[PDB]
Symmetry: none
Subunit: 102 residues, 2 copies
């Protein structure tokens, strides 16, 4: 009917562009494979997994941005553990010497 | 037939709705409700270029927030380390004063 087939091709092109744009980094279907998909193949596309792999990638992306800062903080806590420990030990020694200086 | 054609359009329109809804930037002037009802002509003339742009802005804002929450948590830990290292200095000093006394 042409008026029908024009819409289908137009919808297939747009849908290709989106699925390529948001392609998760690990997804087993490549941008080439996506660019090569027809209408029927798109209709049976696995969107729910597509979204899942996207969410994983987003988590990996966000975790990477805050990776250097968290590593610096973790180093500070371990140093904080030892410094707070020696602070206890010296305060004990300090309180003994005061009681034993009468 | 035009049925298998009209069915292909409906299924393709539904998939496209689901995609555009999932990634819809939070601020986009077109709502998830509007998207869910859009027909084929409405989707074909959808303003994707701004849609994609507003997504990148939102994505950037998200990562920048993750890095600022991370920086603030590191700064608070450093300052807690600073004061503890300070109190260790002051008490270690007092300890050495009494050691001579």
């Amino acid at each position: 009917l042409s008026t029908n087939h024009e819409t289908i091709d137009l919808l297939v092109q747009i849908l290709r562009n989106c699925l390529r744009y948001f392609l998760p980094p690990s997804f087993p279907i490549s941008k080439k494979q996506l660019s090569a998909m027809n209408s029927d193949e798109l209709i049976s596309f696995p969107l729910k997994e597509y979204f899942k792999q996207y969410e994983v990638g987003l988590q990996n992306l966000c975790n990477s941005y805050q990776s250097r800062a968290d590593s610096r903080a973790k180093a500070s806590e371990e140093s904080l553990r030892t410094s707070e420990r020696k602070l206890r030990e010296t305060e004990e020694k300090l309180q003994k010497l005061r009681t034993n200086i009468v």
